[PDB]
Copies of this chain bind each other. A is one copy, B any other.
Amino acid sequence: SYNITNSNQYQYFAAVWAEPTPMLNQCVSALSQSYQTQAGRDTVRQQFANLLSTIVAPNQRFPDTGFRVYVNSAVIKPLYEALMKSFDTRNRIIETEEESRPSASEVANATQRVDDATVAIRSQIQLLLNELSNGHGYMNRAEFEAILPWTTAPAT
């Protein structure tokens, strides 16, 4: 069966998989909304997490009856953490009592901070789209390989 030991072959186990369908659809769910909210962007990242699960264990090899998405590869990982990060936060401070601080934006501490955050998530959501989908990132038993052991309960 599959019997892994060498640690160098463990950079593709947990928090590095999904499927073309699940991932791409999640991204559209995000992009199609306003960036003046927390519910949306915050929950969005939390959506992607639910799919950032695992698949290849140390005993049952990757099946031919499947093709998952290595969420920590070429363009996905760097631009997906960079992307999901774009909506990190912002200098949110609603200085009020009931009425927003009267002369709040006279000599304030933010404006283009919120505006510029939006640009981040926005356009990166797109470049991701094309890269993500194509081949930059994808993998299956075909591309999942190196020098892997197989020796537990027989089945070949």
Which residues from chain A sit less than 8 Å from chain B, CB to CB? Answer: 5, 7-8, 10-11, 13-15, 20-22, 24-26, 28-29, 31-36, 38-39, 42-47, 49-53, 60, 67, 72-75, 77-79, 81-82, 84-86, 88-93, 95-111, 113-115, 118, 120, 122-127, 129-131, 133-136, 138, 140, 147
Q: Which residue in B36, B113, B133 is a CB contact (below 8 Å) of A11? A: B133
Whether B96 contacts A100 by the Cβ 8 Å rule is yes
Bound-state Cα–Cα, A75 to B31, Å: 13
A81 contacts which chain B residues (CB < 8 A)? 31, 125-126, 129
Whether A29 contacts B89 by the Cβ 8 Å rule is no
Whether A50 contacts B130 by the Cβ 8 Å rule is yes
Bound-state Cα–Cα, A53 to B108, Å: 45
Q: Chain B: which residue is nearest A29 at the CB level?
A: B75
Bound-state Cα–Cα, A153 to B78, Å: 39
Whether B126 contacts A49 by the Cβ 8 Å rule is no
Bound-state Cα–Cα, A22 to B138, Å: 12
Whether B104 contacts A97 by the Cβ 8 Å rule is no
